[PDB]
Structures are given as structure tokens and as C-alpha cells.
Amino acid sequence: MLSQANEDFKKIVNNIRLKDTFDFKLAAFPNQNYDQLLPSQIYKNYYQGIEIQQHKYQNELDIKIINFLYPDGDFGSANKNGTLKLSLMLTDKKNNQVYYKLLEVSGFKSNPYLEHHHHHH
Numbered sequence: 422m423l424s425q426a427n428e429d430f431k432k433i434v435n436n437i438r439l440k441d442t443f444d445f446k447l448a449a450f451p452n453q454n455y456d457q458l459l460p461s462q463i464y465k466n467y468y469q470g471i472e473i474q475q476h477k478y479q480n481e482l483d484i485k486i487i488n489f490l491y492p493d494g495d496f497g498s499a500n501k502n503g504t505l506k507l508s509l510m511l512t513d514k515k516n517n518q519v520y521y522k523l524l525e526v527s528g529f530k531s532n533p534y535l536e537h538h539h540h541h542h
Contacts, residue, residue: 434482434511439526443484444474456528460505461496463529464489482520483512490523503530 439445439455447453447463448470455463467488475484487508491499499505507524 430481433477434520434522437477437484437509437522437524439507439524439528442477444476445486446472446474448472455526458529460489460491460499460503460529463505480514483510483514485510485512487521492525498536500530501532501536503527503532505529 437443445453445455447458447466449466450458450463453463467486471486473484473486487510490506490508492502492504492506494502504525504527507526509522509524511520511522513519
């Protein structure tokens with residue numbers, strides 16, 4: 422019930438989600454849906470531009486997407502787990518500083534038992 426504690430501030434940052442906290446949009450994909458767009462395809466837009474639709478107390482933390490990363494793994498596996506790390510830089514509205522936070526998200530693609538594809542022998 423009403424809590425502006427140090428843990429809550431950081432909790433807001435670690436509880437940022439591409440549906441709960443911000444609905445994003447890619448410059449080349451104006452009608453994009455993160456529940457179908459492939460990881461490598463979304464990544465192609467980080468220089469072209471990304472739009473942020475806010476939902477949380479953004480007067481406290483600024484949401485800016487830097488780029489899209491994997492869980493320290495191969496792009497091949499990326500198709501089986503279908504998860505990306507959203508690299509966001511939270512700029513202080515009250516200190517003008519900047520904090521970095523990776524967000525482990527899913528929904529793009531998922532081949533759990535459908536990955537046995539070989540390029541060659």
C-alpha cells in the first residue's frame with residue numbers, strides 16, 4: 422500500500438516488459454507484432470528507429486532501447502528458445518545519469534522439439 426522505497430524503484434526497472442510496461446514499434450515495421458516478428462528481423466531496425474509506448478512511471482525512469490542480444494548463445498539456438506535480451510538505458514529524470522538493464526523476453530518464435538536442422542554434412 423503506497424511505497425516509494427529504494428527496492429521499489431529498482432523493482433520498477435527490473436519489472437519492465439514489452440507488453441506490461443512499453444509497447445514498442447520498429448521503423449521498418451509500423452504494424453509490427455512482437456508475437457510473430459523473428460529476433461534477427463527485429464534487430465535490423467535498431468539503427469532505423471524504435472518507438473516507445475509508455476505505461477509506467479516514466480517520470481522516474483526513461484525507456485530507451487539500445488539493441489537486441491541473445492542469452493550469451495548462438496543465433497541457431499535462438500530459434501528453439503525464442504528469447505531476447507532487451508538492452509534498455511534508463512536515464513535519470515532526477516539525476517541526469519544513466520542505468521543499463523537487460524530484459525529477458527519471449528514470444529517471437531519457439532521450436533522446443535522442432536530443432537534438428539542441418540546446413541550440410
